[PDB]
Write a protein that binds this ligand. Structure first.
Ligand SMILES: [Mn+2]
Ligand SMILES: [Mn+2]
Lengths: 126, 126
């Protein structure tokens, strides 16, 4: 099984969001619930100016690929700016957050070593 | 453990290359051999005009995130064009290749659900 996706391909998929992540929204591009793919899953996220993916953790490792804008990555308490062209490795259990303090949309893919997004449980910072 | 990488971060690391895939060069940005990360590993690769990542396969599932240019993806016999903005899902052991037909450099990240690149064995197709 091999397939190609971009944002245009998922226009018919409504954005996902939640009130806990203000100004954040996402779609699934590679995911067993949509594609019958396995082993790896990938989403595209946008954080609007002033938006905040608040401090959280989860069991699998995660990678971010930043494709647009800039924001402040909270590395379990240590702040670092990130921007287009950056990739981020987040170990399992590691608390992290990402704030868009800029005027452009902060856009990134995330990747999990899992079949599905739905099998990753998000936990709030303890 | 959380870290950020970009091209500048690995300016020190020399471009890897081979003859199996002429015109192709790459670096490792998230990799146990370098970072002691685990769960996922990620590299960045460049294909010069004329370059040809030839038909191969490997056990782990794989994702490409295409960040510049355009190319022709060989999906186990069926051709599809890919370009900047595209993501590609490649099932474990599915045969695939990627050729740069454009004039610009074809650039992409690849991602494996493995700790390190070095542990993945590439197999030409028969
Ligand atoms: Mn996360
Ligand atoms: Mn491959």
């Amino acid at each position: 099984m091999i397939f190609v996706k971009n944002l245009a391909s998922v226009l018919s998929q409504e954005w996902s969001s939640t009130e806990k992540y203000p100004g954040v929204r996402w779609k699934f591009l590679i995911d067993a619930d949509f594609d019958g793919s396995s082993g790896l899953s990938l989403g595209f996220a946008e954080i609007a100016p002033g938006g905040d993916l608040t401090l959280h953790y989860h069991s699998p490792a995660e990678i971010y690929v930043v494709t647009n804008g800039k924001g402040i990555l909270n590395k379990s308490g240590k702040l670092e700016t990130i921007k287009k062209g950056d990739v981020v490795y987040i170990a399992g259990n590691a608390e992290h957050a990402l704030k868009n303090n800029g005027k452009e949309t902060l856009e990134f893919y995330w990747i999990f070593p899992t079949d599905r997004f739905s099998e990753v449980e998000y936990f709030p910072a303890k």
